[PDB]
Amino acid sequence: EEKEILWNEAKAFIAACYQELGKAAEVKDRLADIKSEIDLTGSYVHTKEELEHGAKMAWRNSNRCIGRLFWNSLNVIDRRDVRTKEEVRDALFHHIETATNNGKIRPTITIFPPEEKGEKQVEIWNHQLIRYAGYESDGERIGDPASCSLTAACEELGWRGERTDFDLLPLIFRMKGDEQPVWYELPRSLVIEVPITHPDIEAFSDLELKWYGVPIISDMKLEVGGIHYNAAPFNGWYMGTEIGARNLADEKRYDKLKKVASVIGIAADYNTDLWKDQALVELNKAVLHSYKKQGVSIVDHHTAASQFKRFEEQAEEAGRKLTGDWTWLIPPISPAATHIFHRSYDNSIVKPNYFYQDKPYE
Amino acid sequence: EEKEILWNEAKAFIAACYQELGKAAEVKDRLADIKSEIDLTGSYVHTKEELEHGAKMAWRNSNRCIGRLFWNSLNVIDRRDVRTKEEVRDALFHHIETATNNGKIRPTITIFPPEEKGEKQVEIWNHQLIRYAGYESDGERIGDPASCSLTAACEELGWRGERTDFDLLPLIFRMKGDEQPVWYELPRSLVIEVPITHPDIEAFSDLELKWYGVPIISDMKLEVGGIHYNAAPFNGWYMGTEIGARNLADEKRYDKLKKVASVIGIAADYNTDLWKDQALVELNKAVLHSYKKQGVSIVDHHTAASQFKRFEEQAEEAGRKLTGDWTWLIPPISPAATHIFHRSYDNSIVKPNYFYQDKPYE
Ligand code: HEM
Ligand code: HEM
Ligand SMILES: Cc1cc(N)nc(CCc2cc(C#N)cc(CCc3cc(C)cc(N)n3)c2)c1
Ligand SMILES: Cc1cc(N)nc(CCc2cc(C#N)cc(CCc3cc(C)cc(N)n3)c2)c1
Ligand SMILES: C[C@H](O)[C@H](O)[C@H]1CNc2nc(N)[nH]c(=O)c2N1
Ligand SMILES: C[C@H](O)[C@H](O)[C@H]1CNc2nc(N)[nH]c(=O)c2N1
Ligand SMILES: [Cl-]
Ligand SMILES: [Cl-]
């Protein structure tokens, strides 16, 4: 059954991919080769063209992503050749450097060897390549609560954080054959961060907020034509609300709205004053201002929604069905100010795609 | 088939209703009577207790309503006795008066005779009993665009609006046997309105905004135990975002965000300034302030979400399944500041319930 699933996924992908690339005549010969290869080895190897276009198709098919207009300009780095933990580490360092691009962020994915028999070759423990640690001991909360379990796992392995609110977690991953993951501290010269200030309110800097420049998701599996690339970190640039309305505002994250209310000079006492709403707007204005001033790529939710409208239009013009998850596509502030709010979306799963997977810790 | 559907819906409703009322022993005798009544007449008549509890159950089951904590205190007015258009008109006037209650709004439903053979006895044309007219002629837009088609239908019938931005539409309804609906102007003494001012920004009154006090939905069908009450207007009090983030802000409604930005002294030129978001917050603060100052009932979205949390808790304690539509329950500003955003809801339809229906015009 294993191999039949593979063959069926392969047929569908190759036909679709080659059609999009204007290579439809080469499909039969390619499929023949693949069938024989599956016959002998139990799997098949993507050409560099297939792998690159597959990762792009996967982004295009990601229902929860508002940023998909730019799917075709994804920078795909093929690292299926890595075999050592130093090579993995260096590939991850390289991804950070080339994606960051001195602040002019390049959407990039680095693809490591795929699962073989469901056997991972490389298992990345980080949720993002750059993320802050979190601690909760004896009532006392420090850093990003979303990182508490991973932070504890790292500290079991001999890492120790300084216990600021913004400790960078080390890269941590396990190779096939190793019982334990290895970890490596991130070189600070590779990691751009942005201090959060407000365009008009000088006191905003008293909050001493900052965030990292580049979100590099490293716990999803890329599936292309039945091949499962469990290790394939990818990044875009942030939409400002991710930082200002979720990471810094959620009560189960940095929980900063009361502090923001205080520095902008409004009371945080009455629901009817809409102080949370006002604080959200100023925090989100500060985030966009701060990234722009530093020269680090970022998009606001209005511009992002306008770009997504164009993606919708482009899909229709290309004769491709559009899929989407309305609940994730609406921004978490002013959603009804976007066209997305007033439309519906088919949340069907189309492959290639990116899929969430279990974390070894918990 | 008609009658079998009726009987099946009846059995389910009576058993559930009588169980909730502690009358479970009376179910068999009541069902016997109902079966005979369906046998002879083709339908059955609800007791006043059944009708009242049915309308309450219908509110409790309304997946899209955040206000359901208060389902059991619905004021149910039984007007199944009306036969004339003057009696309907007077019942609607009465609903407005008693629901308004000098500003201390009472959630109320008035129930008119049900459909017989799918034959309506009373057909209300209004979407809400109180709503503003809308006009679009030769490029020129006045009033509420959502009311354009109904406004045009009224004017076909000899009504004429003054063409302010806030003309009250007449009550308009048709009786069984009449080709044309009749209309009646609303007595202004019955209709509370609130001028919109801002707590801190004096210039806000230059926008000359106002809204009506009580939303009285009059185009949904109440279905209880297989009986279809197509005419059964009901009201609550507003959640402020309905007025400030939808009615006054939507581009296809009053479209006031650019004007709000101007009076609060911010530019409306750059998406990254989040001027729409800032304008939304101030407009919504003004709405809540203005209703509160006048002594007209209103709820903010934070308090509303907290009440809904209690409804969720109450359902669990009662052993009742909770149903909900996440896409309507999240407020249209700061949705992620509410617990609703972070939970999921089963959007199954449970009866009794309220259902949308076709409007005779278009
Ligand atoms: C170029 C700039 C990009 C922007 C502004 C953007 C924007 C976003 C946003 C706002 C989300 C939702 C996160 C949330 O609301 O909690 C998201 C989700 C997602 N994006 Fe994008 N994105 C970008 C690039 C990419 C790229 C390059 C890929 C992959 C090649 C990608 C794949 C996804 C996926 C898979 C999700 C869902 C993640 C999950 O389920 O946890 N995006 N994106
Ligand atoms: C007591 C105060 C009430 C509040 C604050 C409230 C709040 C709301 C809100 C905000 C909506 C969504 C409208 C939108 O977002 O576009 C809604 C929908 C709804 N409410 Fe309530 N509600 C209340 C009372 C009632 C009552 C008394 C009933 C019926 C007996 C009711 C039945 C419904 C129904 C059926 C809908 C869906 C309407 C549709 O599909 O168009 N609500 N409610
Ligand atoms: C349990 C579970 C299931 C599932 N499917 N997804 C998740 C994580 C959702 C998510 C959270 C964060 C955060 N913080 C960032 C993200 C990444 C958002 C993103 C991704 C990219 C590539 C760019 C960009 N601007 N933003 C996603 C958890
Ligand atoms: C095509 C279509 C289908 C469908 N199911 N519903 C609709 C109308 C949705 C709606 C719009 C408005 C408005 N304006 C007010 C409402 C009423 C909201 C409400 C109702 C009540 C009783 C109280 C309260 N505070 N708010 C609903 C259109
Ligand atoms: C159907 C379409 O998604 C539309 O925007 C829905 C979304 N959610 C909503 N939620 C509420 N509360 N009210 C609405 O009118 C809508 N409209
Ligand atoms: C699952 C639950 O409804 C949760 O709040 C979802 C809602 N929509 C979302 N939308 C985005 N963009 N990001 C998220 O993390 C979530 N979480
Ligand atoms: Cl993030
Ligand atoms: Cl309304």
DSSP for B196-224, written as a single string: ---SS-GGGGGG--EEES--EE-SEEEEE
- Do A108 and A74 touch, CB atoms closer than 8 A? yes
Backbone angles phi, psi at B66, to 5 degrees: -80, -15
Distance CA A175, CA A181 (A): 7
Could you identify the residue written with the tokens 């139990």? A42
Please give the sequence-ordered ranges of beta strands (E in DSSP) within chain A, or none if there are none: 75-78, 108-111, 122-124, 134-137, 140-143, 171-175, 182-184, 193-195, 210-212, 216-217, 220-224, 227-229, 234-235, 238-239, 298-299, 353-356
Could you identify the residue written with the tokens 């939710």? A301
Which tokens in the block code for residue A156? Answer: 């079991």
Distance CA A102, CA A190 (A): 9
Which tokens in the block code for residue B266? Answer: 């911010």
In order of A146, A302, B181, B214, B228, the CA distances from B175 in angstroms are 61, 48, 7, 25, 16
Largest Cα span, chain B: 71
Please name the residues in contact with B47: beta carbons below 8 A apart, sequence gap of 6 or more.
none
Distance of CA B44 to the CA centre of its chain: 27
User: Which approach determined this entry?
Assistant: X-ray
| Residue B303 to residue A272, Cβ atoms within 8 A | yes
SS3 at position A215: coil
Tell me if A234 CB under 6 Å of ligand 3. Answer: yes
- Bridge partners, B355 (sequence order): B221
Instruction: Classify residue A70 by burial, with Cβ atoms within 10 Å: 0-12, 13-18, 19+.
Output: middle
- Do A252 and A146 touch, CB atoms closer than 8 A? yes
- Cβ-based interface (< 8 Å): residues of A facing B: 245-246, 249-250, 257, 271-274, 276-278, 280-281, 284-285, 288-289, 292, 300, 302-303, 306, 326-327, 330, 332-337, 341
- Bridge partners, B245 (sequence order): none
- Exposure string of A8-34, with b = 16+ CB inside 10 Å and e = fewer, is ebbbebbbbbbeeeeeeeebeebbeeb
Distance CA B301, CA B304 (A): 5
- Do B302 and B338 touch, CB atoms closer than 8 A? yes
| Residue A292 to residue B276, Cβ atoms within 8 A | no
Distance CA B151, CA B159 (A): 9
Is the domain covering B1-80+107-117+221-235+305-329 a CATH 3.40.50.620 domain? no
- Cα R_g (chain A), whole angstroms: 22
Distance CA B169, CA B361 (A): 15
Which of A52, A57, A61, A65 to mutate for ligand 1's pocket (most ligand atoms within 8 Å of CB)?
A: A65
Q: CATH code for B193-215+238-303? A: 3.90.1230.10
Could you identify the residue written with the tokens 């259902």? B355
Distance CA A251, CA B142 (A): 43
| Chain B residue closest in CA terms to A272 | B300
CA of A242 to the centre of ligand 7 (A): 6
Q: CATH code for B81-106+121-192+356-360? A: 3.90.440.10
| Residue A250 to residue B336, Cβ atoms within 8 A | yes
Interface-testing mutation among B237, B260, B281, with chain A (most A C-beta atoms within 10 A): B281
Classify the C-alpha dihedral A306-A310-A313-A319 as positive or negative: negative
Distance CA B161, CA B184 (A): 13
CA of B330 to the centre of ligand 5 (A): 10
In order of A72, B44, B133, B200, the CA distances from B14 in angstroms are 59, 12, 42, 54
User: Given phi > 0 = left and psi -120 to 50 = alpha, else beta, which region is B304?
Assistant: alpha
CA atoms within 13 A on the CB side of B312: 15
- Exposure string of A257-288, with b = 16+ CB inside 10 Å and e = fewer, is bebbbebbeeeeeebbbbbbbbbbbbbbbbbb
Pick from B277, B91, B77, B198: nearest CA to A301 = B277
- What type of residue sits at position A74? L
Catalytic annotation present for A116? no
Same fold, A1-80+107-117+221-235+305-329 and A81-106+121-192+356-360: no
Extents of the domains making up chain B = 1-80+107-117+221-235+305-329, 81-106+121-192+356-360, 193-215+238-303
- Exposure string of A300-330, with b = 16+ CB inside 10 Å and e = fewer, is bbbbbbeebeebbebbeeeeeebbbebeebb
Pick from B112, B131, B245: nearest CA to B186 = B131
- Cβ-based interface (< 8 Å): residues of B facing A: 245-246, 249-250, 257, 271-274, 276-278, 280-281, 284-285, 288-289, 292, 300, 302-303, 306, 326-327, 330, 332-337, 341
Distance CA A235, CA A244 (A): 18
Please name the residues in contact with B32: beta carbons below 8 A apart, sequence gap of 6 or more.
none
